[PDB]
Design a protein around this nucleic acid. Structure first.
Lengths: 75, 141, 64, 49, 191, 141, 137
RNA sequence: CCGAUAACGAACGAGACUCUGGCAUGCUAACUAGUUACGCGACCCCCGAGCGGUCGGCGUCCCCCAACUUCUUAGAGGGACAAGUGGCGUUCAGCCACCCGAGAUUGAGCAAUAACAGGUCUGUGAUGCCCUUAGAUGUCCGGGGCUGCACGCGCGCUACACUGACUGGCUCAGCGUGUGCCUACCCUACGCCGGCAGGCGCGGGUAACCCGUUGAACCCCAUUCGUGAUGGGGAUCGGGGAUUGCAAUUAUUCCCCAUGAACGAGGAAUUCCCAGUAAGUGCGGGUCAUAAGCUUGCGUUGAUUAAGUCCCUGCCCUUUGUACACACCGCC
């Protein structure tokens, strides 16, 4: 049953949410954008480097395989 | 900070850069249409192996006093699905490791040793590991 | 009715009954109460010294 | 010792069931009251705990 | 770290085994808080030496299972020294508490053993040596994090770090704490 | 006259001969410090002796290891075992014994076969099976 | 990021825009992944993009090249059609064209009463593997 | 085994043994090991650190009339022997735990009496008898078949993918194996050529020297991909090109293109096994002109779990019943 087909590129309204909505998570990865939002996952892969424009989100530690990717860095 | 003292995988990253930012080596024509080794499935993405592989090959010679084409083929290996068959080991492409050696020879990173096999020459011995200083001292990270 | 949780470990491992050789019969101190003595069949590998857990503190699991 | 706590009375011996069991040989053997001995042994009629 | 033997980055001190019974079987630190979860290992030689192996590494091994991945401890040692770095972000404190106060309340208190019972097999309530609980709990969350992570791209480090929180808390939201329920539930039906 | 204590520790067929000279002492395997080697997930693994006993404890001890044989992972408890054994023979033979014993304690309170050779080695295959023990599946009607 | 293309149609064969450009070329009969980068390497189309992007010039640049390969340096590995036989032409067949060529060489073998033809005619293996146990449909 | 003991003391099997596998800074040594580290005497280039002294380091310049066995090798040795202590035990035979440490078990070969129309006459110039015996079932040439295909079962491999797929890179062996062999024939280092198969140059090799620090895969690390029967998978065919072979049609084997399948974890069943074990993973050997999805070894990565019971299957003894002794697959 598990069928999950998502658009390759974020729509502008959607992008704002990623610009907007991505600040509202902690445990982020190409997964957590492609399941919460309906982004492919390679464009999520991509979006997550775009979102290092000025570290809107924080890298704990990019492991070769898995980005491993935290909340903004508030306090 | 020799080739060893530098964390060897971000060596060839910068040594690939060297030979690109030199703007000379002798890139040729079998290039865009190359398999790399019958070994592989598919032609490589970074369109610029041999700047990064001549990097490898040349540092490799630094680590080892003598190496033939037969040697270079050997070292860049892998498993090889003959498919439903089990995987076996296939040598890399000669042509490419050879022209990598001959091209390194153009800049005179390397030379043909005595007793057969290529080794790297003092001049090249430099360009190689000069940047080792620059890779360690790029920054501590 | 009565529903507590009591942890006790039998002082001595006694036998290894059960059909397939599963259950190691144990004589277990209540732990919650020193005085109480119960016999139960345990499934995991036990020994002399180790605490174990039974849902009902009455059944006193007999020959099986 | 459950019952000797809960006893209204003090001490108390408790009774006993005196059943005269009384098996046919079939069930005596099937349900392991006696067994089945050697030729020399069949004779030895003592009752040994 | 010569002062005290930590764990890549991690405190193993200020960690307590929060239910006696499992204590002395969960070897988070005798004094012996190992740094890594790779270890030579030979805790499969004698029988109750198996416990003295640290619950952490004991979980890496329990994770490198399934046909295409046996004996890739290098691999899974990442996953687990990679998973814990997620928990501490969510919970805080030693995520080793989240591991240890998972296994405790990931695994049951008693279980349902199969006796022969003539023909119709009425399983019997028996307690367990902290082993069939510990072990079952251990796969059930491995298997759980595993099963959840075929066809989402969920990181096994993430997927496991769900389960270890969802079982550290009696959260009833994992795979381990969802079967820890039933074995007890099946046992209750038996008696 | 400085120290010159050579000591080996093994795992499977990975002989790793360490050796301890007196100097500044910053430690290295073949020809590269402990910070690399780069199975990497391990790493702390081979740092352990350092991190246990103290960064001070090799502060008059240049150690140089060499490794052949065995394999990727093995080569590491081989080099771990070696720089704990070698360092042990250091403080024993010329230096003292109390610190040798404070070391040997600090190590053997959690071994990980630090001074103890893992006695194990692989079983042979027997005919009628893929491995030692397992057997080619029984046909049966 | 421009979602405008919403898939594309190329060379008389339906193709998918979303899929990556190297992959998209793959679908047409006579191609494959091998040759389908090499086309996008001579053409100088940036390979890091989706077939539901690009312009009409790009996609024709593909067809001109892929349909007429040898002239834009593509050597003779990546000609599926090597010394055809009906004239010594050696080029790259595509589309139904290969089904046509395929059929014609089956027809040719068959017509020349030769074994390999008979074997297709009957519906068997051509390549002498044993069909005792496999080839059951 | 001890002991109860009409038996006492003996013999074969088990055990002991051999090979093997692991502790042996203990010995004898070793340019056909290694070497080791020196001494470092150097070349030596900033290979790298460092202003320079000095140092970290591969390579070499070696050689040697260093020195040595730290690992390598293989000889002699030792040891490990329920040996100590604490339980348990008829307080014997032993069992269990712990100490020192390899804790009494690392793994095979060898394997009795006695069997069995087991298999083998096609391993035997071992062969009883029988056939056949020139038109020869004597030996071959050419071809063909042993490969054929609506179905059935048997051992294998590869998958089903993202703890993974393909894209960079780093980098760790072992047991072997090799020419120049009983009749014509290898192992291969290093040059060019070619994409590659390969091709064409040339070099060492009765080998611990040459292949060959056997420079591997998983593995490990570097980017793609995004859960699509998709980039997994990878069948079936189209077309080329090499190689072996006098000859591959009946795709020989290999490469290069090109097509591009079912399988998204397997219905009824059932084998395998406890420690360096299962699994994966290549690699040798055997098979070989050509050549392996075969086995037999070898490491390598290396788990989970039983550590008990006889619940199923099948084995040992004892007692017993038995109309069975072609032995219950019986007898009736």
């Amino acid at each position: 049953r598990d069928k999950l087909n998502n658009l390759v590129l974020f729509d502008k309204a959607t992008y704002d949410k990623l610009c907007k909505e991505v600040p509202n998570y902690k445990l982020i990865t190409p997964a957590v954008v492609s399941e919460r939002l309906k982004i492919r996952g390679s464009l999520a892969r991509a979006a997550l480097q775009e979102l290092l424009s000025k570290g809107l989100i924080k890298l704990v530690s990019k492991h070769r395989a898995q980005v491993i990717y935290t909340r903004n860095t508030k306090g | 900070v020799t080739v060893k003292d530098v964390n060897q995988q971000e060596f060839v990253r910068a040594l690939a850069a060297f030979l690109k930012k030199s703007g000379k080596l002798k890139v040729p024509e079998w290039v865009d249409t190359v398999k790399l080794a019958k070994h592989k499935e598919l032609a490589p993405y970074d369109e610029n192996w041999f700047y990064t592989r001549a990097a490898s090959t040349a540092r490799h010679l630094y680590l080892r006093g003598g190496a033939g084409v037969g040697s270079m083929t050997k070292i860049y290996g892998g498993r090889q699905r003959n498919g439903v068959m089990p995987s076996h080991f296939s040598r890399g492409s000669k042509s490419v490791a050879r022209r990598v050696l001959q091209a390194l020879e153009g800049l005179k990173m390397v030379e043909k040793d005595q007793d057969g096999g290529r080794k790297l020459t003092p001049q090249g011995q430099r360009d190689l590991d000069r940047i080792a200083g620059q890779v360690a001292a790029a920054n501590k990270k | 009715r009565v529903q507590p949780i009591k942890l006790a470990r039998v002082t001595k491992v006694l036998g290894r009954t059960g059909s397939q050789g599963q259950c190691t019969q144990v004589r277990v101190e209540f732990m919650d109460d020193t005085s109480r003595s119960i016999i139960r069949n345990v499934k995991g590998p036990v020994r002399e010294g180790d605490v174990l857990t039974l849902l009902e503190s009455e059944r006193e699991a007999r020959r099986l | 010792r459950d019952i000797s706590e809960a006893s209204v009375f003090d001490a108390y011996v408790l009774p006993k069931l005196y059943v005269k069991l009384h098996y046919c040989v079939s069930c005596a053997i099937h349900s392991k009251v006696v067994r089945n001995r050697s030729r020399e042994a069949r004779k030895d009629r003592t009752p040994p705990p | 770290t010569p002062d005290i033997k930590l764990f890549g980055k991690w405190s193993t001190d200020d960690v307590q085994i929060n239910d006696i019974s499992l204590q002395d079987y969960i070897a988070v630190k005798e004094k012996y808080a190992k740094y890594l979860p790779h270890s030579a290992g030979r805790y499969a030689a004698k029988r109750f030496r198996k416990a003295q192996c640290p619950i952490v590494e004991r979980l890496t091994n329990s994770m490198m299972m399934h046909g295409r991945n046996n004996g890739k401890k290098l691999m899974t040692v990442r996953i687990v020294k990679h998973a814990f770095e997620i928990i501490h972000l969510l919970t805080g404190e030693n995520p080793l508490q989240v591991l240890v106060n998972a296994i405790i309340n990931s695994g049951p208190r008693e279980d349902s053993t199969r006796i022969g019972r003539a023909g119709t097999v009425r399983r019997q309530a028996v307690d367990v040596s902290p082993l069939r609980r510990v072990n079952q709990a251990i796969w059930l969350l491995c298997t759980g994090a595993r099963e959840a992570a075929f066809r989402n791209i969920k990181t096994i480090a993430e997927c496991l770090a769900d389960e270890l929180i969802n079982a550290a808390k009696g959260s009833s939201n994992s795979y381990a704490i969802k079967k820890k329920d039933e074995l007890e539930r099946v046992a209750k039906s038996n008696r | 006259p400085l120290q010159s204590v050579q000591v080996f520790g093994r795992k499977k067929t990975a002989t790793a001969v360490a050796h301890c000279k007196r100097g500044n002492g910053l430690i290295k395997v073949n020809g590269r410090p402990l910070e690399m080697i780069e199975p990497r997930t391990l790493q702390y693994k081979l740092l352990e002796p350092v991190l246990l006993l103290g960064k001070e404890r090799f502060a008059g001890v240049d150690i140089r290891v060499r490794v052949k044989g065995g394999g990727h992972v093995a080569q590491i408890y081989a080099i771990r075992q070696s720089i704990s054994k070698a360092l042990v023979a250091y403080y024993q033979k010329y230096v003292d014994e109390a610190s040798k014993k404070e070391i040997k304690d600090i190590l053997i309170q959690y071994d990980r076969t630090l001074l103890v050779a893992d006695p194990r080695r692989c079983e042979s295959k027997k005919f009628g099976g893929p491995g030692a023990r397992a057997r080619y599946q029984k046909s049966y009607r | 990021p421009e979602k405008f293309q919403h898939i594309l149609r190329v060379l008389n064969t339906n193709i998918d825009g979303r899929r990556k450009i190297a992959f998209a070329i793959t679908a047409i009969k006579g191609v494959g992944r091998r040759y389908a980068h090499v086309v996008l390497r001579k053409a100088d189309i940036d390979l890091t993009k989706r077939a539901g992007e690009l312009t009409e010039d790009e996609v024709e640049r593909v067809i001109t090249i892929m349909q007429n390969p040898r002239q834009y340096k593509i050597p003779d590995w990546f000609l599926n059609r090597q010394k055809d036989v009906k004239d010594g032409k050696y080029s790259q067949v595509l589309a139904n064209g290969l089904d046509n060529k395929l059929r014609e060489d089956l027809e040719r073998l068959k017509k020349i009463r030769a074994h390999r033809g008979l074997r297709h005619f009957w519906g068997l293996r051509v390549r002498g593997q044993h069909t005792k146990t496999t080839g059951r449909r």
